[PDB]
Amino acid sequence: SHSLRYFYTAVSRPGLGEPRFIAVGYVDDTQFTRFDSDAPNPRDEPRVPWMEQEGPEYWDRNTRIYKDTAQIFRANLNTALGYYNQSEAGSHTFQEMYGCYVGPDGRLLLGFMQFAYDGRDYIALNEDLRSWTAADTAAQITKRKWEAAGEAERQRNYLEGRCVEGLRRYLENGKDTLLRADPPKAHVTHHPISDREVTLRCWALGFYPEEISLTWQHEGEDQTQDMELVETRPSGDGTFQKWAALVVPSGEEQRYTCRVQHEGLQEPLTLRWE
């Protein structure tokens, strides 16, 4: 399953001018575009090397879309102050994420479009793409308004059409890197805790995509209950890294193995401290 997703953030800054608006585009988990209203030259730009086929008109068009949206988000933040009777004095945030997940049949699997005010659900487009869920009484005003205006239909048309067409195109264009699989470079380290115990750490670096399985075992038995894990983290170069650790008795390290599995392998890799 693949997706095209856009993320918008507007942050008000009283006494400092208009809100800053930032829009970021994602194909699957890869950031591929960015617009920042605060940039010396506020323009939508590629954040990836494989978007070079698009013309100047492409980025010009996106830029104007985001500029128009920035204006809307400013209005949204002002309106929210009224709805919630809040002061013009404080900073507030308004966020949107929307996009399309496509099934192997090449058609929309799930379209979504959600909004948040100050980091909490405000209003969202339901899965049927024909109705809204309002999170509170303020958002119920918006719901009434968007229902009267027939907003849902236009969003559904986008999610089912342009969004899907775009994903198809970008996936095709970024194919060589988006769909690649770089296997992890994995190894085991050994760190004494005390006289009785030591830490065995199973490392995996430089892998893509980010999904990976690291499983400590004791004489063949799955020990995925006593492992210490870190959340998979970005290497900074587009790859990911992660480790899984187990505390074992000193002198019994040889009884344990780390099983590493990832798309870029073929079959599991079995590692051990020796």
Binding site: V11, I22, R34, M97, G119, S235, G236
Partner: protein, 99 residues
Amino acid sequence: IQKTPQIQVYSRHPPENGKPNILNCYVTQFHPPHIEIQMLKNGKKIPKVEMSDMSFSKDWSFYILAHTEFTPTETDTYACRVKHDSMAEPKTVYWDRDM
């Protein structure tokens, strides 16, 4: 309304003393988006620290990757310090070669 930043500090490649590397400070799950991140070498702020674009997750919380070039030595130590309204005082995490 206020979410506390989680911090991981780690090198891009396994550290080898004398070999150029990249030090990462990965800061996640915070709100509001305003945040002040710095990285320190031997207790002193590093001026040359790049920041990724800030984005947010499915839960609406923000995240960002701070990074800087460094060449690990046997004595040089490193930290990442984060200031955010969700915390009374800034939070520091020290780089540990073993993690």
